[PDB]
Amino acid sequence: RIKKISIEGNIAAGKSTFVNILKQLCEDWEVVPEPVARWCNVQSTNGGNVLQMMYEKPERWSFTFQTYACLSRIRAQLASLNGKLKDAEKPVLFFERSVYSDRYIFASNLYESECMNETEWTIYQDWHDWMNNQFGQSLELDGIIYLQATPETCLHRIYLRGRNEEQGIPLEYLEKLHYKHESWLLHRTLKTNFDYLQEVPILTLDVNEDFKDKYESLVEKVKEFLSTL
Numbered sequence: 110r111i112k113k114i115s116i117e118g119n120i121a122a123g124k125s126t127f128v129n130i131l132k133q134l135c136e137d138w139e140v141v142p143e144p145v146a147r148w149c150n151v152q153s154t155n156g157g158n159v160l161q162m163m164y165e166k167p168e169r170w171s172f173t174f175q176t177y178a179c180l181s182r183i184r185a186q187l188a189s190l191n192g193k194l195k196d197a198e199k200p201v202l203f204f205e206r207s208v209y210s211d212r213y214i215f216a217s218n219l220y221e222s223e224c225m226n227e228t229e230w231t232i233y234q235d236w237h238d239w240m241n242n243q244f245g246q247s248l249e250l251d252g253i254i255y256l257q258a259t260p261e262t263c264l265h266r267i268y269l270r271g272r273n274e275e276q277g278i279p280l281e282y283l284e285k286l287h288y289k290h291e292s293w294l295l296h297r298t299l300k301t302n303f304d305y306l307q308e309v310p311i312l313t314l315d316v317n318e319d320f321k322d323k324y325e326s327l328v329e330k331v332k333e334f335l336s337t338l
């Protein structure tokens with residue numbers, strides 16, 4: 110039916126930059142952006158900034174954040190499936206991140222860093238497993254595009270974007286997130302509770318260079334990659 114591709118990378122690697130060039134390349138391509146502005150002003154579907162709360166006190170707010178982060182993603186991705194506009198000779202749905210990074214990169218890292226205790230960690234995974242059982246098949250990936258950039262490039266791009274909440278993030282934290290992505294998507298040694306992911310095709314794009322100069326080659330590689338799926 111709808112081909113589903115998720116775009117993965119470190120904080121400020123360039124996912125929104127990349128996402129913003131995709132719709133102009135095929136009118137059959139849709140994008141589900143990550144709801145980060147919604148994490149900064151919590152309201153029902155002004156309020157709490159839950160991203161900021163986590164970063165200011167991660168031992169307190171990581172479980173709450175991670176749980177709300179993932180659910181709001183699921184809601185958003187589901188909304189665009191059943192979201193009418195599909196009917197196209199070749200529909201492709203791009204997800205900015207996935208329930209698998211949420212758990213295997215981000216939540217895992219905070220647990221491993223003592224920001225979630227055993228109880229919190231057990232509840233999260235239990236919730237995440239159940240959520241996948243219900244809405245898992247719907248959201249299964251046909252491919253991953255990994256936007257690879259050094260932690261140091263990312264640190265700099267955090268500065269460039271100037272999002273208030275992310276300005277205090279240390280290189281160390283970005284390095285941990287770097288190595289988890291490399292383990293999952295480069296070496297493919299990170300094991301998950303979802304077997305199909307081990308054979309899912311992966312496109313790796315080195316995005317350390319200037320977006321203007323790399324744009325044309327990246328477009329070629331994305332089209333080339335989609336045609337093999």
Ligand SMILES: Nc1ncnc2c1ncn2[C@@H]1O[C@H](COP(=O)(O)OP(=O)(O)O)[C@@H](O)[C@H]1O
Binds near residue numbers: 121124266319
């Ligand atoms: N390849 C690139 N070359 C130059 N600047 C970039 C590149 N990719 C991203 N940026 C810049 O880096 C910052 C973060 O990019 P963004 O797309 O918001 O990252 P993400 O969406 O992955 O968090 C923004 O200032 C953006 O202008």
Ligand SMILES: Nc1nc(=O)n([C@H]2C[C@H](O)[C@@H](CO)O2)cc1F
Binds near residue numbers: 120178206212
């Ligand atoms: N599961 C997640 N946990 C996080 O902590 N983030 C953070 C990273 C970045 O600072 C901001 C926007 O992605 O949210 C993003 C996730 F998807």
Ligand SMILES: [Mg+2]
Binds near residue numbers: 143
């Ligand atoms: Mg983004």
